[PDB]
Amino acid sequence: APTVNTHFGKLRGARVPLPSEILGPVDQYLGVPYAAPPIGEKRFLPPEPPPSWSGIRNATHFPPVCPQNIHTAVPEVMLPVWFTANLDIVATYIQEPNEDCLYLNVYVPTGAKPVMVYIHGGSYMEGTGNMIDGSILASYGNVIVITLNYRVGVLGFLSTGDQAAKGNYGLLDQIQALRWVSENIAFFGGDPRRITVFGSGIGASCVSLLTLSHHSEGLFQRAIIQSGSALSSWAVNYQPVKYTSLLADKVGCNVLDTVDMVDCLRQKSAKELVEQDIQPARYHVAFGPVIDGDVIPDDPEILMEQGEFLNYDIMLGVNQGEGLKFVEGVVDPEDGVSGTDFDYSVSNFVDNLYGYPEGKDTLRETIKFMYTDWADRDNPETRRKTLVALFTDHQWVEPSVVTADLHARYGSPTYFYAFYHHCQSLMKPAWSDAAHGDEVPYVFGVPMVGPTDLFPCNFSKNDVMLSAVVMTYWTNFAKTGDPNKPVPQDVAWSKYNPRDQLYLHIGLKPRVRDHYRATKVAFWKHLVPHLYN
Amino acid sequence: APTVNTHFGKLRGARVPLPSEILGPVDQYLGVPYAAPPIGEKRFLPPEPPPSWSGIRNATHFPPVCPQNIHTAVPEVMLPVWFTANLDIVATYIQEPNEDCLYLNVYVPTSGAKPVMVYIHGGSYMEGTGNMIDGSILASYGNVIVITLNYRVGVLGFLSTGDQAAKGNYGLLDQIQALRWVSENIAFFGGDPRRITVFGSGIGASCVSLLTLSHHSEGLFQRAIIQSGSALSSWAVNYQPVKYTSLLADKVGCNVLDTVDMVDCLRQKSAKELVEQDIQPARYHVAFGPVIDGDVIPDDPEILMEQGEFLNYDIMLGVNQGEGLKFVEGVVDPEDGVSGTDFDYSVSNFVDNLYGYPEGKDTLRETIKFMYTDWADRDNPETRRKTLVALFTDHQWVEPSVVTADLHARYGSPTYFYAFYHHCQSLMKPAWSDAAHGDEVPYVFGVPMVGPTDLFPCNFSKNDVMLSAVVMTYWTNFAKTGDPNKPVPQDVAWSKYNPRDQLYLHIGLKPRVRDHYRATKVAFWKHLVPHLYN
């Protein structure tokens, strides 16, 4: 009977043993409420402390998730491959969503440990931390892991552009639960002074926005930002009023007064709100974080150059083939791409991102030239690879590299990595590289357990080894802020600085390199702004 | 007493032994006239057959060179390094120029009729002669006949009024006349008229490339070697002849109403003054040179290339690593580096000189700056110097030559491409430089077997001798058969170049075969730059 006393009462979890002998059992407390239910009047309001419970709360099962709908159309390119490919299994977790969803789960190994807090996210529309089991890395690394479910969708990110609905409510739930962890993880044997928060995809964007938030001050010390950033085109919504008014239109309270319209939208059922389709601009988001002046006073890059996040230890990275779905729709059975298709895709990308400025033709020709392998011009498979690389560099690699440059500007510890490995399975085509979300199983130690319903890949021994080393780096950074100390591998991960640009090649043979795709990074960072107004 | 009978009479040469024992002696006939003296009235006229002589003509010494002046200002970038650096020794050869300067020199080895090479010298279309180069080494080693000729140069060689008064291209006409002479008379020396190749370096390579595009050159030669030159370079053909011609006429005060009367007045003047006049053309352009006349060059060179004139010739061509050395030497600090301000200044100046302030110049300048910046080592000045060299080297030499090669092997005509990645060590060139303009000529003519000379004081090692032997073997093999690999084997095979494989040979102390020599920059200059502006 694993029991823990907290500032709000006692709760009992369950001790679960891992299938493999080598790692010992972990004690998991499932569904701990961190805030008062955001229901009724609390809707579209900052979270508030949860009420106390007198007895001993049973924490063994999974509370209902926040209102979300996977069948509703969402930007497919954003969601991780293991999510869309296994939507069927996703349905088992996502069934029975409820508005009262502000809960978290804890996994504790059997002095004080670091505390990892993982923020999930698919598209700011769906997702839950209920998917992932934090047991395995907790057991191997001897770290306390927490998973969290926060308000999502309209209830989580609706904004009216004013005091009627400031928005950014998901971030508020995250800081509220981070405060909960800071105040109460010492009860579980954790180290409040050693707290790190990490996420993949959109969750990484949430974390990166948190390090730029004044409200996040003092709660956490380190962070990991995986395959995400606050500078991406789909990170922060710059036109909230338009989509908010569109939603208000569809549900039938469009009124002139924003306060009256939100008092309307409090009455409607959450099922109606989620079931709506609102299609934003391609490679943009409809409902998400907005520049409110309180949580995010200004544009992300502004807060970056100002120097808020220089006091945190940050490790971040990208994957080689993130933008798989940018090209999956056009690939022929010959595993190649025709020149007409290449031109069509590049032109469409320019149209979507840059919205027809002056000098568009020069930019289009420059992009076509820069991502064409002139040593193998005629080859279609190389065309497919470069068409992947275009989206992968522009959407993921460049913002993350800019982030790293802005962090280590004054010598603050920073680490950069590129994931060059992935499982083999049927969820993804064989010709693909490591796409979006394929690093997730390794960091959470799926290879130690083997194939599961969410990750049915055929795992080999090399998969287990790479899972071990990557999770070891993660835990070492959590404990010391150094991926190399105190536990050694049985290669040293050097620090990243703006002139050396030292990064870690993670793969079957990990190593140290420099200037990760520096040419394309500089092309996007420097040359592209000059061509157009 | 080496004597030879020709269609015009008998001549006496001299037998000379090479300093190295292994190579045999060669017989040289110096100053064989291939045309009538172009003096007075025949000035600014096409060449005419040389009058015949009854007796035996002495062919022992070097005739006077064509009227030219090394002291007068000339584009320094165009001239080869061994020329400008050893201008002092060049002065000894260049002394006492004369207008009676249509002569050639033959060097013959001592089985069967032998292939014939004709070397077209050239520094800048202003200067130079075939006298400084002694082909005895190449003749002895390769067992081939070598000819070095003198053609009209400067004002007398390329004056053009844009009309029938002065069509120009008289130097091209001179080399056509000499090619006709050797074609008709080399069999007397034991050569093979069906196997003749013409080759040149720098400007001479541009002359050869223009000749292969000329209708007047059909049937005289079969192969050609174009080294570090092209007909597509910015200084190959003068597109503004009338402006500089009128400038010269104004300078000498021969300005009258009728252009025919003007060229008559130029005929009346002394030869030296026409040389001494300073007429500085646009930077990286030429003042006096070949023009689009409609007779020798009917149209623009690329038009003749795409039309298919030169597909009947076997072509081998190549470039060097650091041709554009002079483009950066003026700005290099004693630390062997370049400041970012210097880099920006030089790049902007290059854009100004070449493209002349078009619409969208600002965007193109930034694109060019980005493309030639090593973003893996941005702050390093030495790599900045290397990239500043490579910019000029690619734009002026590599891109036109690669375009030429692509236009030749389009329908499968045999083509060969090479890149020279080696050079001697010497004081004429700074130690940090790669093979610059004119560092390949010593090896093809095999000076390393002799050792250091007045014109190449380089400190030759054994590797120099070996590489020189290999390259002259390749050259001679191509001349004999049209195959660099046949019949004499190296003691690597040079594959053919085609637009799809782009196979080339890496000539150096480590020879090998590669593909797509700097394909990225070649495509950048060939494709993106035209679209960048207008």
Author numbering:
A (entry chain B): 41 to 150, 198 to 577, 591 to 633
B (entry chain A): 41 to 150, 197 to 577, 591 to 633
Question: What text comes from the article?
Answer:
Neuroligins are postsynaptic membrane cell adhesion molecules that connect presynaptic and postsynaptic neurons, mediate the transmission of signals between synapses, and shape the characteristics of neural networks through specific synaptic functions. NLGNs belong to single transmembrane proteins, and they all consist of a large extracellular, acetylcholinesterase-like domain (CLD) and a carbohydrate-binding region, following the transmembrane region of O-glycosylation helix and the C-terminal intracellular region as postsynaptic density zone (PDZ) recognition component, which mainly binds to postsynaptic target proteins such as Gephyrin and postsynaptic density protein, thus promoting synaptic differentiation and strengthening the stability of synaptic space and the function of transmitting intersynaptic signals. The ectodomains of NLGNs can form specific cross-synaptic connections with neurexins (NRXNs) of the presynaptic membrane, and these connections can be regulated by the membrane-associated mucin (MAM) domain-containing glycosylphosphatidylinositol anchor (MDGAs). The NLGN structures were highly conserved in both human NLGN2 and human NLGN3 dimer forms as two symmetrical elliptical spheres, and the interface comprises a four-helix bundle including two helices from each protomer.
